[PDB]
Design an enzyme around this catalytic site. Structure first.
Site, mmCIF file in Angstrom:
data_model
loop_
_atom_site.group_PDB
_atom_site.id
_atom_site.type_symbol
_atom_site.label_atom_id
_atom_site.label_comp_id
_atom_site.label_asym_id
_atom_site.label_seq_id
_atom_site.Cartn_x
_atom_site.Cartn_y
_atom_site.Cartn_z
ATOM 1 C CG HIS B 39 148.301 92.532 129.042
ATOM 2 N ND1 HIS B 39 148.828 91.291 128.756
ATOM 3 C CD2 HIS B 39 149.352 93.382 129.088
ATOM 4 C CE1 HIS B 39 150.130 91.398 128.565
ATOM 5 N NE2 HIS B 39 150.474 92.658 128.750
ATOM 6 N N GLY B 141 157.825 95.437 128.061
ATOM 7 C CA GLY B 141 157.586 95.825 126.691
ATOM 8 C C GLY B 141 157.669 94.698 125.686
ATOM 9 C CB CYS B 143 153.448 91.643 126.284
ATOM 10 S SG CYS B 143 153.700 90.986 127.924
HETATM 11 C C1 LIG Z 1 154.293 92.522 128.670
HETATM 12 O O1 LIG Z 1 153.188 93.397 128.806
HETATM 13 C C2 LIG Z 1 154.836 92.177 130.110
HETATM 14 C C3 LIG Z 1 156.125 91.284 130.074
HETATM 15 C C4 LIG Z 1 156.630 90.867 131.482
HETATM 16 C C5 LIG Z 1 157.210 92.117 132.174
HETATM 17 C C6 LIG Z 1 158.668 91.762 132.558
HETATM 18 N N1 LIG Z 1 158.951 90.436 132.016
HETATM 19 C C7 LIG Z 1 157.838 89.888 131.401
HETATM 20 O O2 LIG Z 1 157.820 88.793 130.879
HETATM 21 N N2 LIG Z 1 153.774 91.521 130.843
HETATM 22 C C8 LIG Z 1 153.280 91.973 132.070
HETATM 23 O O3 LIG Z 1 153.739 92.941 132.606
HETATM 24 C C9 LIG Z 1 152.099 91.148 132.740
HETATM 25 C C10 LIG Z 1 150.743 91.821 132.498
HETATM 26 C C11 LIG Z 1 149.520 91.092 133.139
HETATM 27 C C12 LIG Z 1 148.176 91.806 132.849
HETATM 28 C C13 LIG Z 1 149.423 89.621 132.694
HETATM 29 N N3 LIG Z 1 152.365 91.002 134.190
HETATM 30 C C14 LIG Z 1 153.501 90.338 134.685
HETATM 31 O O4 LIG Z 1 154.272 89.755 133.932
HETATM 32 O O5 LIG Z 1 153.762 90.331 136.026
HETATM 33 C C15 LIG Z 1 154.981 89.910 136.641
HETATM 34 C C16 LIG Z 1 156.214 90.799 136.239
HETATM 35 C C17 LIG Z 1 156.119 92.300 136.513
HETATM 36 C C18 LIG Z 1 156.583 92.850 137.724
HETATM 37 C C19 LIG Z 1 156.504 94.230 137.993
HETATM 38 C C20 LIG Z 1 155.941 95.095 137.051
HETATM 39 C C21 LIG Z 1 155.463 94.577 135.836
HETATM 40 C C22 LIG Z 1 155.552 93.197 135.577
HETATM 41 C C23 LIG Z 1 154.692 89.853 138.186
HETATM 42 C C24 LIG Z 1 155.828 89.141 138.993
HETATM 43 C C25 LIG Z 1 155.413 88.702 140.396
HETATM 44 C C26 LIG Z 1 154.128 87.806 140.363
HETATM 45 F F1 LIG Z 1 154.319 86.726 139.661
HETATM 46 F F2 LIG Z 1 153.820 87.373 141.570
HETATM 47 C C27 LIG Z 1 152.978 88.681 139.759
HETATM 48 C C28 LIG Z 1 153.288 89.196 138.364
#
Ligand SMILES: *[C@@H](O)[C@H](C[C@@H]1CCNC1=O)NC(=O)[C@H](CC(C)C)NC(=O)O[C@@H](Cc1ccccc1)C1CCC(F)(F)CC1
Ligand SMILES: *[C@H](O)[C@H](C[C@@H]1CCNC1=O)NC(=O)[C@H](CC(C)C)NC(=O)O[C@@H](Cc1ccccc1)C1CCC(F)(F)CC1
Lengths: 297, 299
Positions: B39, B141, B143
């Site tokens: 991603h 950040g 990931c």
């Molecule tokens: C690394 O890119 C990042 C690490 C996450 C961010 C905060 N804590 C972590 O462990 N990964 C992501 O952002 C990831 C990307 C997707 C393409 C898989 N999405 C993600 O983790 O989504 C959750 C957290 C988030 C909230 C708001 C903004 C960014 C990230 C969401 C929480 C609620 C849900 F589960 F319903 C949907 C995803």
């Protein structure tokens, strides 16, 4: 979660030091290796060692220092309090930017536990108010160090020397001075009464709230002094105004005033947790500082 | 007994950052390949539901910025393997340790080196829960941070971080890009299964208590594995596998307490409670220390 600093910068400094049948770890910075002085002891020596007497009878060649496969030649040695300094003919290219600090009770640090000069594990510790540390150290762990990292700089604060009857641990700063009333002799030593690190319990209660866990909160409040009276009764450290100031960021983040969180802690102290848990713990945790919580949340 | 991580230095020497556009995450540099979550090729808006194949088809080597610190590593090839991107670079990492990629089982523990912008911030010990989540500490950040074990000289990489779930727990892949659990790398709400207690690790913890002289809970009886599994499930405990019985072997040999006798002791704790007592200074049964973690710390 309990998080340690990455240990790579310290791993590149660990060596093995042997004198006689005694082996432990040393810290190789530039052209000096630092290690506990009791490496020069025998079994008989350890009960009431006269270290200055034992050391003058040693030569450079009685010290075997190994960095992996490679022996390092000792060309000088001196003793600074409870630490032995071995001058070697070669400088460690992996030496990080570093300082030696003496930490205060309640502060936390990471420990790189090592055996025979080889790193084994890393974990986070606090200096207890009674100047012990609740470590995980076995035979051969002496010379393992504790540290914090800021920017690119390793601040060494702890070198490991001994275990007490209760199973907690004691050691020195890197100037060789013990934390606490302890001595590097093979005798059973008790610590003073321990207390709980109150500012750290509060920081951890804030962490519980930041992670959505708030059952322990209440609508009561308290003055700083009234809280401190209850704290001391329960063998908790007093909270200073600096501690209140240091919790500010966490109070702002959550919108819970410091003294309101003190009122919550007071109720927990007086009533206990009623079989409940906070961040998964059955006990109030006191080895996360406010900085530890902030840096991680 | 402390939660003890592996020394992180061999992994620190492999962390890089990978950027596409303004999206930056961490990558793992081994030999002349950098591994990271796919991603990274998403705009924040494409994460809603991305078409990774179409997104990648539009990408060239020269769209990927890989940096070790602030030093750029030139990308010379790219491919996607499940949910991880593999970027071939023109420099072999001189700090590459001996390594392997492994897929761990729920209950197993590993160390996580949490990284931001290719810079390690902290290391901690994690257990894979039975529902294939981990209770990590991960911020924006993070990931591409990895989880690992070290055996002798060899780093076994088992986890790469991709996402957070609504409940605050975390999910990710092995280093072949296959998610642990039913999750997908899309910015949509996804629920883990209800979690359960890792029985093999509770047993390891009871063996550790015995080793330290805390043995009031040892009883006179035994059980069959099947009877134990059927009862354990009623208390939201995982059933034991044959592999679990085998990895308890060393602790069983060290204490002389048969695995099935310890199971009978645990069954009694489950059915009658701790009757007000504690084990290793705890009223709670700990389930994030494996048999290997116990051995690694006691001896
Ligand atoms: C690394 O890119 C990042 C690490 C996450 C961010 C905060 N804590 C972590 O462990 N990964 C992501 O952002 C990831 C990307 C997707 C393409 C898989 N999405 C993600 O983790 O989504 C959750 C957290 C988030 C909230 C708001 C903004 C960014 C990230 C969401 C929480 C609620 C849900 F589960 F319903 C949907 C995803
Ligand atoms: C250095 O590697 C070593 C580390 C100890 C070993 C076990 N866990 C540790 O942290 N330190 C020592 O051996 C130290 C040496 C003195 C000269 C300072 N002695 C020590 O820690 O003694 C305790 C542990 C021990 C037990 C059995 C054999 C050797 C060491 C004793 C605990 C019991 C007691 F209190 F009665 C006396 C000290």
């Amino acid at each position: 979660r309990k998080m340690a600093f990455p240990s790579g910068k310290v791993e590149g400094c660990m060596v093995q030091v042997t004198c006689g049948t005694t082996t432990l770890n040393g810290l190789w910075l530039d052209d000096v290796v630092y290690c506990p002085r009791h490496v020069i002891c025998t079994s008989e020596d350890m009960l009431n060692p006269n270290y200055e007497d034992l050391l003058i009878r040693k030569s450079n060649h009685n010290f075997l220092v190994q960095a992996g496969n490679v022996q390092l030649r000792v060309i000088g040695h001196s003793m600074q309090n409870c630490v032995l300094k071995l001058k070697v003919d070669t400088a460690n290219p992996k030496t990080p930017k570093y300082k030696f600090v003496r930490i205060q009770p309640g502060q936390t640090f990471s420990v790189l536990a090592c055996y025979n000069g080889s790193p084994s594990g890393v974990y986070q510790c606090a200096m207890r108010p009674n100047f012990t540390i609740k470590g995980s150290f076995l035979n051969g762990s002496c010379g393992s160090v504790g540290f914090n990292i800021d920017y690119d700089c390793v601040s060494f604060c702890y070198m490991h020397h001994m275990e007490l009857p209760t199973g907690v641990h004691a050691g020195t700063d890197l100037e060789g001075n013990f934390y606490g009333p302890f001595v590097d002799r093979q005798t059973a030593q008790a610590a003073g009464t321990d207390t709980t690190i109150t500012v750290n319990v509060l920081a951890w209660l804030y962490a519980a709230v930041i992670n959505g866990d708030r059952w322990f909160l209440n609508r009561f409040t308290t003055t700083l002094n009234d809280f401190n009276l209850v704290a001391m009764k329960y063998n908790y450290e007093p909270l200073t105004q600096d501690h209140v100031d240091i919790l500010g960021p966490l109070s702002a983040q959550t919108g819970i005033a410091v003294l309101d969180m003190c009122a919550s802690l007071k109720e927990l102290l007086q009533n206990g947790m009623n079989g409940r848990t906070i961040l998964g713990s059955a006990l109030l945790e006191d080895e996360f500082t406010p900085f530890d919580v902030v840096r991680q949340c």
